[PDB]
């Protein structure tokens, strides 16, 4: 049972194939066209189906050459509208038929975000980008949208001549539109069965330059130069992905990166990451989040959750995965350090929620929850804990990646619960069963908070971050004298974010000590994000007035969740900024992508 959708599930019938034929429409913020279903029937006799829809207006349905019958039930929330269709002539087991929909989206599209001339980096073009998990694929096209059902996909897209399409698939050309020559057409085949929300479009003034055999980087003009060189090691990292995962079965592995309203890190959709321009830090050393989007090509995409209360599945394998990637590249040492910063985020989540909250569970229940109001880093970190844990309980790294390879192959192009997961883990380590048969499956499955164990972590690189910490927090003023630049002459800019995420655990620190961080480190100087933002946090939370300009222009500038709403808070939860950002959050709420406005309003207490 797929609580998050109100479709027919898999057990009823099951999308083959989509062909999507559009048009987007920049004057009236609309995408109109035909959904072409190919659906096979799971049941004898098979009469109606459902499908999922989110502010959609249908025009029509059509089977056979004709019309048929169709119901838009009430709107049931988030969850959307369920669409019933009357089949003409009913179906035995195993037949499959093409249902085609001609439909039209809402410009309030929560899978879409229409942006503004001015809001992109050329001020000549408009643009729009798509984000369809978990839910929001609905939004876009009437399908049944939950990962337990994997399709293929076509589709041809008509946008104004001057602009660039490109989707989660293999380019397959691009013409004149027949029918105006102002526009373009451009195609897309995607011939790996894939879960519908990672089904991508992005629409905008878009050029591209190649970093490696098989990855092309697009970004508007602006952006080329500079991303091509932060992703440079793109190809490595895939290297050392097909020898962890498997051989990588999608073609190509290209990178898009979005204007800066961009709500997440990255988005994995296949043949075409989606990531922010927050990663462009000038010195590569955000690249875990690529790591993080190569991983997805295994674990998510061809081993899928098959349904949202399985996330962790998604999450804890990419994230384990990820931190081997970097193990690779830059040393176990390293891999030690970011597992144990992980713990650190899952702490802080952990704190956030409260110990005891449903959302801090790593098996969630997300009946009558709005999928994105659970989203967190809890099943990422909790996730990577656990398998974390039981490589270090089974006999460590290569004894565990021959597991992860082993349970990629077993399910790749399956949709698979926690129950399957496990099963497969007892089997692959039946000689291992006794040490399996001592892990607290309900406590670090079901149980709120932190796990029950934590994991054994080489400290070597976090102690001169949690040393240099503890000298501030317990520093007097007569201390402050003795802080110097030459603190941070041999810290990386890892450790650098790791020393404020320590001290920002404790926050907040006396004014002064802030004002002489400043006086001392000039952390204002620095441009990378993660610093910036922990920075930021820990001077509002400390009550620094200077830092509240600093703080609105970062939050606004660009809208990663992950930045953008804790600084929100912060600066509503400090008394001196607190009108200044429930007013700024009114006069951009307009011009914010849907589901983050949702949010922050939330976060606000602003309707
Ligand atoms: C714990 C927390 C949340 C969930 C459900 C969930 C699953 C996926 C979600 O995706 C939100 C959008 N993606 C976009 C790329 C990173 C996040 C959001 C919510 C399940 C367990
Ligand atoms: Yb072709
Ligand atoms: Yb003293
Ligand atoms: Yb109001
Ligand atoms: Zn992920």
Known sequence: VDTCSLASPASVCRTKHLHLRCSVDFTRRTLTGTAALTVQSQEDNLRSLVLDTKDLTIEKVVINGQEVKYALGERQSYKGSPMEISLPIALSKNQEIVIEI??????????????????????????????????????????????????????????????????????????????????????????????????????????????????????????????????????????????????????????????????YGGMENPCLTFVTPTLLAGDKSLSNVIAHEISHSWTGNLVTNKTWDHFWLNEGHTVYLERHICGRLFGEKFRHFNALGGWGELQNSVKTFGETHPFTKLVVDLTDIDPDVAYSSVPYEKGFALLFYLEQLLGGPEIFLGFLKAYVEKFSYKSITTDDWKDFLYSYFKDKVDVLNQVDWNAWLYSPGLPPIKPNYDMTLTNACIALSQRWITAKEDDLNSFNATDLKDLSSHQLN????????????????????????????????????????????????????????????????????????????????????????????????PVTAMLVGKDLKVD
């Open 498 to 593: 790791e020393f404020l995420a320590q001290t920002l655990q404790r926050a907040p620190l006396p004014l002064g000590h802030i004002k002489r961080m400043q006086e001392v480190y000039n952390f204002n100087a620095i441009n990378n994000s993660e610093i910036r933002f922990r920075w930021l946090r820990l001077c509002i939370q400390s009550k620094w007035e200077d830092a509240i300009p600093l703080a609105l222009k970062m939050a606004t500038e660009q809208g990663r969740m992950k930045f953008t709403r804790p600084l929100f808070k912060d600066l509503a939860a400090f008394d001196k900024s607190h009108d200044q950002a429930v007013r700024t959050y009114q006069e951009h709420k307009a011009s914010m992508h």
């Open 102 to 263: 001609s439909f039209e989206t809402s410009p309030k599209s929560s899978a879409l975000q229409w942006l503004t001339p001015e809001q992109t980096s050329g001020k000549e073009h408009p643009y729009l980008f798509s984000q369809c998990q978990a839910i929001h694929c609905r939004a876009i096209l009437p399908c049944q949208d939950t990962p337990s059902v994997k399709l293929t996909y076509t589709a041809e897209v008509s946008v104004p001549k001057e602009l660039v399409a490109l989707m989660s698939a293999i380019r397959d050309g691009e013409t004149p539109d027949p029918e105006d020559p102002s526009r373009k057409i451009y195609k897309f085949i995607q011939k790996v069965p894939i879960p519908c929300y990672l089904i991508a479009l992005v629409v905008g003034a878009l050029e591209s330059r190649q970093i490696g055999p098989r990855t092309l980087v697009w970004s508007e003009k602006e952006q080329v130069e500079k991303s091509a060189y932060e992703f440079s090691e793109t190809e490595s990292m895939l290297k050392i992905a097909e020898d962890l995962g498997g051989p990588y079965v999608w073609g190509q592995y290209d990178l898009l990166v979005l204007p800066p309203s961009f709500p």
